[PDB]
Amino acid sequence: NYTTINYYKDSASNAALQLTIGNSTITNSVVAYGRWPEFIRDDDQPTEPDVATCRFYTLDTVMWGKESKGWWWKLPDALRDMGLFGQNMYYHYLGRSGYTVHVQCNASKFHQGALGVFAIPEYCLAGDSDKQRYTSYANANPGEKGGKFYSQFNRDTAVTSPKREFCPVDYLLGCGVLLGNAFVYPHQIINLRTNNSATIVLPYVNAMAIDSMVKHNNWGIAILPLSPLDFAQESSVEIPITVTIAPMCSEFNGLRNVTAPKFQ
Amino acid sequence: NYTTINYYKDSASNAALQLTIGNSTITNSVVAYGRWPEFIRDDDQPTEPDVATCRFYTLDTVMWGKESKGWWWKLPDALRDMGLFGQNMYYHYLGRSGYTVHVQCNASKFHQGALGVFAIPEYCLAGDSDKQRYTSYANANPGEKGGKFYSQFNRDTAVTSPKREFCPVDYLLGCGVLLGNAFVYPHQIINLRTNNSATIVLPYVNAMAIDSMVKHNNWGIAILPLSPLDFAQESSVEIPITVTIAPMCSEFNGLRNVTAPKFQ
Amino acid sequence: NYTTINYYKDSASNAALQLTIGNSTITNSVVAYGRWPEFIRDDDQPTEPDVATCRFYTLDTVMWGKESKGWWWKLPDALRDMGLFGQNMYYHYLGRSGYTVHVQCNASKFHQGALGVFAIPEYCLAGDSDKQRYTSYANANPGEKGGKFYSQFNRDTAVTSPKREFCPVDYLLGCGVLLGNAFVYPHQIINLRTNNSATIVLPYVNAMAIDSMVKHNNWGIAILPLSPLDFAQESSVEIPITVTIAPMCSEFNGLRNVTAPKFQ
Amino acid sequence: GLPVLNTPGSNQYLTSDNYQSPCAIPEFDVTPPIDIPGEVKNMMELAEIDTMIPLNLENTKRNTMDMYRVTLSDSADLSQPILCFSLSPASDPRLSHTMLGEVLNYYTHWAGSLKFTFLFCGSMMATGKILVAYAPPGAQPPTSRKEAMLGTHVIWDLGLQSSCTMVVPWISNVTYRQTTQDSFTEGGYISMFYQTRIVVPLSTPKSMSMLGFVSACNDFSVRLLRDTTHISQSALP
Amino acid sequence: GLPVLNTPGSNQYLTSDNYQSPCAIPEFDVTPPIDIPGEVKNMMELAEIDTMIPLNLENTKRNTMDMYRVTLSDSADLSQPILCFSLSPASDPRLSHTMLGEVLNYYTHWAGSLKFTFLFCGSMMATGKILVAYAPPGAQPPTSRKEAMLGTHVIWDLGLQSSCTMVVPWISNVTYRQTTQDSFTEGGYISMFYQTRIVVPLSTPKSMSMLGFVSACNDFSVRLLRDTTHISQSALP
Amino acid sequence: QRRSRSESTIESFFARGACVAIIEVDNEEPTTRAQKLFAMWRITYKDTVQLRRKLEFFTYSRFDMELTFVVTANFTNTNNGHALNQVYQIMYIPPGAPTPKSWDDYTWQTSSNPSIFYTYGAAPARISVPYVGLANAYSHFYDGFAKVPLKTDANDQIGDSLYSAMTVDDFGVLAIRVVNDHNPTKVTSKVRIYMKPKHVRVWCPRPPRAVPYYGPGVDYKDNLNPLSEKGLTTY
Amino acid sequence: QRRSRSESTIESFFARGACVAIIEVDNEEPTTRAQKLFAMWRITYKDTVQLRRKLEFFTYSRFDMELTFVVTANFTNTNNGHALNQVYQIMYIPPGAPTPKSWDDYTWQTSSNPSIFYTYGAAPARISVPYVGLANAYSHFYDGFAKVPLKTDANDQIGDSLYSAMTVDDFGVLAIRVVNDHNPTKVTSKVRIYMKPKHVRVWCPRPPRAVPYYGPGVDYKDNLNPLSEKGLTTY
Ligand SMILES: Cc1cc(CCCOc2c(C)cc(-c3noc(C(F)(F)F)n3)cc2C)on1
Ligand SMILES: Cc1cc(CCCOc2c(C)cc(-c3noc(C(F)(F)F)n3)cc2C)on1
Ligand SMILES: N[C@@H](CCC(=O)N[C@@H](CS)C(=O)NCC(=O)O)C(=O)O
Ligand SMILES: N[C@@H](CCC(=O)N[C@@H](CS)C(=O)NCC(=O)O)C(=O)O
Domain boundaries, chain G: 1-235
- Cα G105 to Cα G108: distance, rounded to the nearest angstrom: 6
C1 lies in some domain:
no
Rg (CA), chain C: 22
CA A168, A169, A170, A174 dihedral sign is: negative
Looking at CA atoms only, how far is residue E39 from chain D in angstroms? Answer: 20
Is residue D132 within 8 Å of residue D154, measured between CB atoms?
yes
For ligand 1, is residue F129 a contact (CB within 6 Å)?
yes
Range of A28's domain? Answer: 17-264
Cα A6 to ligand 1 centre (Å) = 22
Query: Going by C-beta distance under 8 Å and a sequence separation of 6 or more, which residues neighbour residue B220?
Result: B72, B73, B74, B75, B119, B120, B121, B122, B123, G143
Do the annotations mark residue G52 as ligand-binding? no
Task: Report phi then psi at A170, rounded to 5.
Answer: -60, -50
Q: Give me the sheet containing A219-231, strands edge to edge.
A: A147-148, A71-75, A219-231, A111-121, A187-191
Residues E120 and E70: their CA atoms lie apart, in Å, by 10
- Partners of residue E71 on adjacent β-strands: E209
Three-state secondary-structure class, residue B90? helix
CA G168 to chain CA centroid, nearest Å: 15
SS3 state at A90:
helix
DSSP H/E element including G92? strand G87-93
Measured distance CA(D102)–CA(D100) in Å, rounded:
6
What is d(CA E88, CA E116) in angstroms, rounded to the nearest whole number? 13
Q: What is d(CA A30, CA E131) in angstroms, rounded to the nearest whole number?
A: 96
Length of chain F: 235
Whole-number Å distance between alpha carbons of G211 and G226:
7
With CA atoms as reference, report the closest residue to B184 among B124, B116, B248, B136: B116
Q: Which approach determined this entry? A: cryo-EM
Which helix (H) or strand (E) element contains residue B140? helix B137-140
H-helix or E-strand spanning residue B249: strand B239-255
Minimal CA–CA distance to B206: which of B198, B215, B197?
Answer: B215
What is the distance between the alpha carbons of residues E46 and A96, in angstroms, rounded to a whole number?
78
Query: Which among E171, E164, E134 has a CA at the least distance from the CA of E149?
Result: E134
Angle at B172 between CA B166 and CA B176, to 5 degrees: 75
Kindly tell me the sign of the dihedral angle through the C-alpha atoms of B148, G229, E88, C258.
positive
SS3 assignment, position A230 = strand
Closest CA to E119 of B119, B177, B116: B116
Of F12, F62, F128, the CB nearest to D21: F128
Q: Tell me the CA distances in angstroms from C26 to C14, C51, C62, C247, C249, one per residue in order.
A: 55, 16, 19, 14, 19
Query: Do the Cβ atoms of E26 and F15 come within 8 Å?
Result: yes
Q: Which ligand is nearest to the CA of D16?
A: 2
**Would you say G1 is a known binding-site residue?**
no
Alpha helix locations (H) across B19-60? none
In single-letter form, the type of residue at position C50 comes to D
- Report chain E residues touching chain C, CB-CB < 8 A: 18, 135-140, 142, 147-148, 150-152, 169, 171, 173-175, 188
C242 found inside a domain: yes
Tell me whether residue B10 is in a domain: no
Q: Is F138 touching ligand 1 by the criterion CB < 6 Å?
A: yes
- Indicate whether C10 belongs to any domain: no
How far, in Å, CA of G105 to CA of G175, rounded? 12
Q: How far is the CA of G84 from the centre of ligand 1 (A)?
A: 29
Q: Which of F19, F20, F22, F188 to mutate to test the pocket of ligand 4 (most atoms within 8 A of CB)?
A: F22
Residue B9 lies in a domain: no
**Burial class (CB within 10 angstroms; exposed 0-12, middle 13-18, buried 19+) of A80:** buried
Taking an 8 Å cut-off on Cβ atoms, the answer to whether D97 and F204 are in contact is no
C-alpha closest to that of C241 among C80, C59, C79: C59
Distance, CA of F153 to CA of E56 (rounded, Å):
111
Deposited resolution, Å? 2.6
Strand positions, DSSP E, chain A: 19-21, 24-26, 30-31, 57-58, 62-64, 71-75, 92-104, 111-121, 147-148, 187-191, 197-202, 219-231, 239-255
Q: How far, rounded to the nearest angstrom, does the alpha carbon of residue E192 sit from its chain's CA centroid?
A: 17
Backbone dihedral region for residue D59 (phi beyond 0: left; psi -120 to 50: alpha; all else: beta): alpha
Torsional sign, CA C210, C213, C215, C217: positive
Chain B contact for C8 (CB, 8 A cutoff): yes
- Sign of the alpha-carbon dihedral angle for E45, E48, E52, E53: positive
Pocket lining for ligand 2, CB < 6 angstroms: E 24-25; G 43, 45, 65, 67, 90-92, 114-116, 127, 129, 132, 138, 171
User: G93 C-alpha to center of ligand 4: Å?
Assistant: 18
Instruction: Give the Cα separation of B26 and D192 in Å (integer).
Output: 50
User: Is residue D18 less than 8 Å (CB to CB) from chain E?
Assistant: yes
Q: Are F83 and F161 in contact (CB under 8 A)?
A: no
Does the beta carbon of F43 sit less than 6 angstroms from any atom of ligand 1? yes
Q: Which of F123, F228, F235 sits opposite D11 (nearest CB)?
A: F123
CB atoms within 10 A of CB D175: 23
DSSP letters spanning D97-122: TSHHHHHHTTEEEEE--EEEEEEE-S
The answer to whether E26 contacts F4, with C-beta atoms less than 8 Å apart, is: no
Q: Provide the terminal-to-terminal Cα distance of chain F, rounded to the nearest Å.
A: 35
Query: CA triplet F38, F39, F45: central angle to 5 degrees?
Result: 160
Tell how far CA E112 is from the center of its chain: 12
Q: Using CB atoms within 10 Å of the CB of residue G65, give its burial: 0 to 12 exposed, 13 to 18 middle, 19+ buried.
A: middle
Q: Domains in chain A: how many in total?
A: 1
- Inter-chain residue contact D65 with A203, CB threshold 8 Å: no
Nearest to F125 by CA among F173, F84, F174: F174
- The dihedral built from the CA positions of residue D115, D116, D120 and D121, taken in this order, carries a sign that is positive
Cα distance between residue D148 and residue E136, in whole Å: 77
Helix, strand or coil, per DSSP, at residue F20: strand
Rounded Cα distance between E176 and E47, Å, is 17
- In order, the DSSP letters of chain C are -------SSSTTTS----EEETTEEE---EEGGG----------PPB--TTTSSS-EE---EEE-SS---EEEEETGGGTTSHHHHHHHHHEEEEEEEEEEEEE----TTEEEEEEEEEEET-----SSSSSS---HHHH---SS-EE-BSS------SSS-------BGGGTTTTS-GGGGGGSSEEEEETTT-SEEEEEE----SSSSB-SSS---EEEEEEEEEEEEETT-S---EEEEEEEEEEEEEEEEE-SPP-----
List the chains bordering chain C where 3 or more Cβ pairs fall under 8 Å: B, E
| Phi, psi torsion values for A85, nearest 5 degrees | -60, -45
Nearby residues of A197 by Cβ (< 8 Å), 6 or more positions away: A102, A103, A104, A105, A190
Measure Cα distances from F183 to F30, F121, F155, G210 in Å: 11, 18, 54, 63
Taking the C-alpha atoms of residue C192 and residue C202, their distance in angstroms, rounded to an integer, is 24
For chain G, the chains sharing at least 3 beta-carbon pairs closer than 8 angstroms are B, D, E, F
C24-26 and B197-202 strand pairing: unpaired
Q: How far apart are CA B121 and CA B143, in angstroms?
A: 17
Please, what sign has the CA dihedral across residues D157, D162, D165, D166? positive
Residues D13, F124: Cα–Cα separation, whole Å: 7
Q: Which residues contact F66 (CB under 8 A, 6 or more apart)?
A: D21, F17, F126, F127, F128, F129, F195, F196, F197, F198
Where is F21: in which H helix or E strand? Answer: strand F18-27
Find the distance separating the first CA and the last CA of chain E, reported in whole Å: 50
Best CA proximity match to C169, nearest among C158, C161, C159, C177: C177
Is B216 inside a domain boundary? yes
Please state, as a whole number, how many other Cβ atoms lie within 10 Å of the Cβ of residue A101.
Answer: 23
Residue F217: which of F135, F142, F138, F139 has the closest Cα?
Answer: F142
| Percent of chain G that is helix, strand, coil (3-state, to 5) | 5, 35, 60
Taking a C-beta distance cutoff of 8 angstroms, is the pair B243, B74 a contact?
Answer: no
- Between chain D and chain G, the number of residue pairs with CB atoms below 8 A apart is 112
Radius of gyration of chain A from its Cα atoms, rounded to whole angstroms: 22
Q: Please tell me the distance in Å from F9's CA to the nearest CA on chain E.
A: 9
Ligand 1, atom nearest to F91 Cα: 21
* Other residues' Cβ atoms within 10 Å of the Cβ of residue E90: 24
Q: Which residues pair with C97 in a beta bridge?
A: none
Under a CB-based contact definition with an 8 Å cutoff, are residues B202 and B119 in contact?
yes
Number of alpha helices (DSSP H) and beta strands (DSSP E) in chain E = 4, 14
Find, among G156, G105, G147, G138, the residue nearest to G204 by Cα.
G138
Contact D3 E5 (CB under 8 A): yes
Breaks (C-N over 2.5 A) in chain D follow: none
Three-state SS sequence of F193-218: EEEEEEEEEEEEECCCCCCCCCCCCC
SS3 E26: coil
Exposed e or buried b for every residue in C122-147, given b needs 16+ CB within 10 A?
Answer: ebebbbbbeeeeebeeebbbbbbebb
Residue B1 domain-assigned? no
Cβ-based neighbour number of residue F187 at 10 Å: 22
Cα separation, C263 vs C141, whole angstroms = 8
Annotated binding-site residue numbers of F for glutathione: 104, 109, 177, 192
